[PDB]
Amino acid sequence: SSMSYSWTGALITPCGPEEEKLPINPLSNSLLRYHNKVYCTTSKSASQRAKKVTFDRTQVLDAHYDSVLKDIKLAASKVSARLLTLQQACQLTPPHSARSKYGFGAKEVRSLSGRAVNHIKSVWKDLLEDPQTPIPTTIMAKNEVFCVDPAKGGKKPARLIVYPDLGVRVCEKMALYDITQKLPQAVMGASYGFQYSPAQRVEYLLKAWAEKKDPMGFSYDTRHFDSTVTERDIRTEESIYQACSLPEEARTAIHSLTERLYVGGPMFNSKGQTCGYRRCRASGVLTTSMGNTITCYVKALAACKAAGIVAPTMLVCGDDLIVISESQGTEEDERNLRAFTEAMTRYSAPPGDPPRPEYDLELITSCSSNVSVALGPRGRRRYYLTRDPTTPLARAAWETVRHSPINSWLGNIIQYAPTIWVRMVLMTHFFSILMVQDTLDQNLNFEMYGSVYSVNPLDLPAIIERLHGLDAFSMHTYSHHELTRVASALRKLGAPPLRVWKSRARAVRASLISRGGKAAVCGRYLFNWAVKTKLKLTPLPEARLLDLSSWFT
RNA sequence: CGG
Numbered sequence: 001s002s003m004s005y006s007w008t009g010a011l012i013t014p015c016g017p018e019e020e021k022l023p024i025n026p027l028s029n030s031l032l033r034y035h036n037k038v039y040c041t042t043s044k045s046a047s048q049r050a051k052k053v054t055f056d057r058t059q060v061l062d063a064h065y066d067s068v069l070k071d072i073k074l075a076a077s078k079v080s081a082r083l084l085t086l087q088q089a090c091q092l093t094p095p096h097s098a099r100s101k102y103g104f105g106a107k108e109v110r111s112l113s114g115r116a117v118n119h120i121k122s123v124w125k126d127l128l129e130d131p132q133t134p135i136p137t138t139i140m141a142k143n144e145v146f147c148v149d150p151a152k153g154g155k156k157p158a159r160l161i162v163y164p165d166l167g168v169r170v171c172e173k174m175a176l177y178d179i180t181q182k183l184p185q186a187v188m189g190a191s192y193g194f195q196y197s198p199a200q201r202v203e204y205l206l207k208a209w210a211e212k213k214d215p216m217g218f219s220y221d222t223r224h225f226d227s228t229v230t231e232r233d234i235r236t237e238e239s240i241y242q243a244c245s246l247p248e249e250a251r252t253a254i255h256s257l258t259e260r261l262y263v264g265g266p267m268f269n270s271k272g273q274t275c276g277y278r279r280c281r282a283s284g285v286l287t288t289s290m291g292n293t294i295t296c297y298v299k300a301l302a303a304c305k306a307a308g309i310v311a312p313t314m315l316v317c318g319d320d321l322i323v324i325s326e327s328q329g330t331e332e333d334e335r336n337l338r339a340f341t342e343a344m345t346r347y348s349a350p351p352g353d354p355p356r357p358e359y360d361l362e363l364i365t366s367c368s369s370n371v372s373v374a375l376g377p378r379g380r381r382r383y384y385l386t387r388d389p390t391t392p393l394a395r396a397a398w399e400t401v402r403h404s405p406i407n408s409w410l411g412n413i414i415q416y417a418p419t420i421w422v423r424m425v426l427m428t429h430f431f432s433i434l435m436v437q438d439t440l441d442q443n444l445n446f447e448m449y450g451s452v453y454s455v456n457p458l459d460l461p462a463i464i465e466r467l468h469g470l471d472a473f474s475m476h477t478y479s480h481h482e483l484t485r486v487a488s489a490l491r492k493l494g495a496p497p498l499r500v501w502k503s504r505a506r507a508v509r510a511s512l513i514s515r516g517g518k519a520a521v522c523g524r525y526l527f528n529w530a531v532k533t534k535l536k537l538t539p540l541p542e543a544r545l546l547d548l549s550s551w552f553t
Numbered sequence: 554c555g556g
């Protein structure tokens with residue numbers, strides 16, 4: 001049947017100038033040495049990505065799918081969802097969102113300038129009046145930082161971003177935002193990934209794991225997922241949306257956005273030229289996360305049925321997936337996964353790496369992270385979330401005239417606070433830089449999965465207690481996997497090894513303590529791992545007085 | 554570019 005794309009031969013052009021690094025990285029050249037390995041994907045590599053994702057799809061459904069789709073619609077039907085006022089939608093546009101072709105940008109939209117509010121009204125009326133004319137879209141390459149891996153080809157080609165003009169995005173939100181906040185949770189319940197913090201993700205997986213008489217786990221990820229999404233898949237997304245109780249005006253807008261935007265359309269590069277046509281998901285539209293998550297859930301739950309996965313518990317995180325099931329013995333389990341992959345491939349969701357059965361929770365990696373284990377202050381086992389730090393370390397080293405890495409550092413410190421690599425390496429480097437800049441008591445802003453919240457470095461110990469618990473300051477005896485991986489990653493980026501970080505950290509601690517106040521609370525809590533005479537830490541009054549539920553839900 |  002359908003091709004994912006077709007191209008004119010016009011280049012994918014850059015959204016402005018694309019920054020290369022500088023000869024000195026003053027913030028990060030005491031963190032690591034191999035700055036040559038850190039790189040940023042650019043539009044120069046866009047064509048190679050385009051070759052890798054242009055292919056022919058041949059979806060083939062079956063009773064298992066149909067049965068699942070059916071159940072998902074009955075679940076959707078228990079949702080009622082309102083329209084958003086043009087104004088409400090305007091004010092959810094982010095502060096630096098790409099400006100519109102019709103001579104205004106995000107400032108005008110969020111302030112509700114009349115010029116802007118006007119253009120958008122007319123755009124909405126055209127949605128309601130015309131359910132057919134394709135809507136044009138811009139195509140850009142994403143700028144994104146990685147460490148080179150010669151094992152996996154050297155340098156990654158940039159992924160493709162495909163979005164309509166600002167005005168349409170606002171209309172998108174009007175028609176569909178309230179649904180994005182309610183549907184995924186409603187059809188998937190506890191399987192919905194983006195509702196849990198790290199400690200909750202870990203708790204869920206453990207409960208899941210212990211509930212089985214004899215558990216088996218595996219993860220799945222679809223190769224180039226957005227290009228594998230079919231016109232049919234997209235129309236089937238519409239019907240899932242339509243199964244909620246909605247005002248009539250939503251339905252028309254939703255339906256019109258589907259046929260004119262979501263199922264496909266022409267693509268223009270930044271220079272204005274016609275670039276290609278698209279019959280797959282455009283990553284850049286409002287329905288991207290919801291769509292991926294839901295369409296992934298359907299296919300996956302079908303494939304579980306297709307393959308005989310017994311008593312599955314799922315966690316869906318976009319196109320990443322984990323399933324914890326009752327094992328049928330390794331002979332059968334291996335067969336069943338081949339079947340799963342076979343079904344998923346029939347549903348047009350082929351794998352990147354073939355999945356594999358596992359019987360130890362530390363060896364399953366999904367949503368870029370994994371559960372590991374260490375000992376707590378009282379000798380008991382303590383389970384927590386962590387990840388390969390390679391890419392975090394690389395991003396910690398991205399400095400340009402326009403961009404600072406301190407934000408990245410913070411993001412990781414908060415998300416992965418219990419990790420040996422955050423405690424020994426990142427926390428040590430973070431606090432050291434800020435002390436010396438004399439900017440310890442100055443807010444930064446941290447963004448995990450969507451929005452951006454302001455944080456004061458001196459509040460980390462409270463925020464970490466609230467979010468990860470007080471054991472997060474006291475854990476020891478990390479696992480072989482986790483020790484091996486951290487050492488290896490530090491070697492690979494030319495950063496000092498752990499024993500050096502022990503030295504630097506003692507020194508940082510002392511400085512923090514000598515400044516007294518909150519700084520010294522940072523010193524005692526965050527760096528107690530670093531001294532022989534470990535102190536007695538106690539819950540922090542500050543912590544109880546805190547609401548963080550907006551951060552990961 | 555979107556949650």
Ligand SMILES: Nc1nc2c(ncn2[C@@H]2O[C@H](COP(=O)(O)OP(=O)(O)O)[C@@H](O)[C@H]2O)c(=O)[nH]1
Pocket residue numbers: 142221222223224225226227281283284285288292318319320554555
């Ligand atoms: N809008 C948007 N969507 C993204 C981005 N990164 C990933 N996604 C979506 O999530 C899908 C799966 O992500 P991933 O497994 O990391 O990459 P892929 O499967 O190789 O495309 C993508 O195909 C996109 O639709 C991004 O930066 N912006």
Ligand SMILES: [Cl-]
Pocket residue numbers: 375376377378379380381
């Ligand atoms: Cl303990």
Ligand SMILES: [Mn+2]
Pocket residue numbers: 221222223224225319352
């Ligand atoms: Mn994928």
Ligand SMILES: [Mn+2]
Pocket residue numbers: 238255
């Ligand atoms: Mn319709």
Ligand SMILES: [Mn+2]
Pocket residue numbers: 221222318319320
């Ligand atoms: Mn993925």
